[PDB]
Amino acid sequence: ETHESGIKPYFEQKIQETELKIRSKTENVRRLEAQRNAL
Amino acid sequence: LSNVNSDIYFKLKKLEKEYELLTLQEDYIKDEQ
Numbered sequence: 001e002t003h004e005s006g007i008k009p010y011f012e013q014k015i016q017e018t019e020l021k022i023r024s025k026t027e028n029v030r031r032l033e034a035q036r037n038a039l
Numbered sequence: 040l041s042n043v044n045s046d047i048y049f050k051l052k053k054l055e056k057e058y059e060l061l062t063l064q065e066d067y068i069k070d071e072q
Binding site: 004008011015018021022025028029032035036039 | 041044048051055058061062065068069071072
């Protein structure tokens, strides 16, 4: 039972390195949108 | 618990495919400004 539960966070660890990218892209769209709307 | 974890494992790959198109839109509004 604990082998099957433990291999689910290690497949998801691949998605967690993508989630640090997707969360840094969303914050930078907010900076560039207030700036683009003034120009 | 094995039925609902399997739907999450497939779903989540198709949902990241979409957010790879939103990361291209952010790059070219740097060039545009």
